[PDB]
Specification:
Distance between the termini: 29 Å
Number of strands: 14
Subunit structure: Homodimer. Monomer; in solution.
Oligomer: monomer
Strand content: over 45%
Helix content: under 10%
Number of helices: 1
Protein name: 3C-like protease
CATH class of the largest domain: Mainly Beta
CATH topology of the largest domain: Thrombin, subunit H
Structural class: mainly beta
Function: Processes the polyprotein. 3CLpro-RdRp is first released by autocleavage, then all other proteins are cleaved. May cleave host polyadenylate-binding protein thereby inhibiting cellular translation.
CATH architecture of the largest domain: Beta Barrel
Organism: Norovirus (strain Human/NoV/United States/Norwalk/1968/GI) (Hu/NV/NV/1968/US)
Catalytic activity: Endopeptidase with a preference for cleavage when the P1 position is occupied by Glu-|-Xaa and the P1' position is occupied by Gly-|-Yaa
CATH superfamily of the largest domain: Trypsin-like serine proteases
Number of domains: 2
Largest sheet: 6 strands, antiparallel, barrel
Shape: globular
Length: 164
Amino acid sequence: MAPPTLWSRVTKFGSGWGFWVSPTVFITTTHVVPTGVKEFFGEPLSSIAIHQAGEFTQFRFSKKMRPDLTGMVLEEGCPEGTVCSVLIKRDSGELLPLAVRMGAIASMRIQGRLVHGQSGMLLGTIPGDCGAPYVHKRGNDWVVCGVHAAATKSGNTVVCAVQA
């Protein structure tokens, strides 16, 4: 369902993953971002516009890092009832797309503060999956609406972080 180009946007990053929204914009989950380094993907921090809001982190690079990609719409979450796919890659290379029905954008306590997020109920994630994108269609275009940030103890509910 997701073409290979879409999966190719999902990229190992820090303690999890992130997602190339366009040639210059990379999104990930805040808690997976390496701390105490001076460069991401070979580019010095001073050359990257970095925005972090709760568990959503966006990097905008000063050059086309992934020119093979078209730019995708990044939404600030999505409406309750949206069916999204979480494009989970595993370190072995296995692709694990999960279909989830989303709840409403709500306040969730993740790692010591409240952040914006949306719950999803699988219509089997692990900590290392954080940063995987939640995507869906807008007509024939793919849109991305958040990044994987948490899951319930039981496992039946996932949380994606969304922009504020």
